[PDB]
């Protein structure tokens, strides 16, 4: 929900 | 002069600048001499020359270290262990489970008729039946499964495939009667139906109860880095060309907004949700699908006022819908909506826990409400009565780590996958009963190359610069002495309410074993570890708290003789790259090695690319005069220190040439600016570039990372 930068 | 130098030259544009409004200064003109590197690799010879020269330079330095090969072979041998998920019950009367025999590029999907599951995941192998082998899709095993949902009838399986790791995908459909066969040659997806749904950037698929079709979100047709614009909701009828799919929602006025739909388990009610940023706030509408033809001719009713709260469907009982929502409850709660009395609003079923973030709510065994809480940086499973909300007790409360819970409302049992820094994955079965339930160990992941009993994870608290108590996990060999000699690998994120949970990584335990190292996970502000208020203390004008927490963790490890002051390595990805580049800028003397993966680094220009504008809720709006002032103070691209008080640590940046999630321009520009600011090192700054990641690629990247840390901190491999 959103597009998040992770890893 | 260092033997590895000099750096590849990078063209500067000394005239390229943007003026920003500032509350303090009126306006600030910022120069960006690497602005040309914002042009995608595909569209610019300059960007191509930079990538190619920087790639070869990094590859030369990394491959010159014999420990690079030593690490690759160590990782490859140790990673050859069987991996699997919990069993997942589906509407075709099979359990489905992910399996990897050890060194396959991608996880395969297997299945077994319910009642025959005692025959799977043995010494002999996965057992059951092969359903879907993603490795067949591409030659190199780079095409990955991005998601799947079985139709309610159990006859159809909708699934997402991204070609070339690109974060665009197509959605395909196959019959559950059409499993992959072991005889199939690679390069093709045999047995699939003609359905091809292109122009999808995220997998959210919701079948109608009639199994005739599914809702999905897509974009206009399009490697590039322009903003993600004009998200639309479509309904695809099974067997039709995508050109026939009916438009359900567009909002031409707000092209940056992301939109999707979810159906209640019964298939009767559809929830529309739009988000305008990364915050947990939505514009939300409900339609009764029994009153509407599918299309733009539907009677949408408002669930709540827009942009106050997020709403996720957790169940339904006729007209009553169960929601997990943060409405006037930042740590989330469970509330009921009656679609028959939409003006009466939401009724609280499970009150907010003021000291615990509610991660998921799901219904099991008809009327058991299972809540997963994040408290003290780990998962808790609470059972509630669905009808009253009354507490029925805890289960698995002895296990401190994370859980994936599997099972549906109609199933009397669940499968729970438990993992931690030290547990690679135990699948428990829990069977609900009349008064009390039954817990059994189903299957555990076993690692033949490693003795987990050699390792421990410590739980400590340390004070930050402002005196805030921060929790930290410390994984190490039991027999490493706290005599201030050990190297550290310290990993952080700090943002977007994402908790750093106990998480199994064999690679990190091998780092601890081979280098007699400690693996440190400070639960810094920006995450959800201590609830949503932990995020709020680590965002916007308080982002500096995140860096101070991380720095204070390093100083605490040195002060308490866990770690040599001369052997601190830090690591971070995406938002975690704000962390590593800011900390490198603000206390370079603390760090001996900095690993940045897919870093967000230009805190002024982030909104201009792909999904960056959504992150304004986290970082602030750089084009807002008040926000500009606190962003500019830490923006790592703009705060590289002068040489002199500063010996810059060795630094390795990982990125792809094309990446939709974080535009590689952040890494491109920062690497150029660092090389330019520190042209003679003495510690090298390198860009490692790759032209649903494969096992091979993950290990080759891990081998570069570990061998580079080893070289930069003077470590000998003690195999
Ligand atoms: Na390089
Ligand atoms: Na959707
Ligand atoms: Na602080
Ligand atoms: Na975090
Ligand atoms: Na780990
Ligand atoms: Na780095």
Author numbering:
A (entry chain E): 802 to 808
B (entry chain A): 3 to 224, 229 to 697, 704 to 731
Task: Pull verbatim passages from the article behind this deposition.
OphP is an essential enzyme for the biosynthesis of the macrocyclic peptide natural product omphalotin A. The enzyme has been proposed to proteolytically release a peptide intermediate from the precursor protein OphMA and to macrocyclize the multiply α-N-methylated core of this intermediate to produce omphalotin A. Our *in vitro* experiments demonstrate that OphP does not process OphMA but shows robust macrocyclase activity on pre-processed α-N-methylated peptides. OphP tolerates sequence promiscuity in the substrate but has a preference for highly α-N-methylated substrates and for N-methylated glycine residue at the catalytic site. Similar to other POPs, the monomer has two domains, an α/β hydrolase domain (residues 1–82, 453–738) and the seven-bladed β-propeller domain (residues 83–452) ([Fig fig4]).
For Oph-18mer^NL^, we focus on subunit A which has the clearest density for the substrate ([Fig fig4]). Only residues ^me^I8-^me^G9-V10-^me^I11-^me^G12-S13-^me^V14 were fitted to the electron density whilst the remainder were presumed to be disordered ([Fig fig4]). The N-methyl group ^me^G12 contacts the indole ring of Trp621 and sits in the P1 pocket which is also formed by Ile606 and Phe502. The peptide bond of ^me^G12 is positioned for nucleophilic attack by Ser580. The hydroxyl of Tyr499 and the backbone amide of Asn581 are well-positioned to function as the canonical oxyanion hole pair to stabilize the tetrahedral intermediate formed by the nucleophilic attack of Ser580. ^me^Gly12 binds to a hydrophobic pocket formed by Trp621, Tyr625, Val668, Asn581, Phe502 and Ile606 ([Fig fig5]).
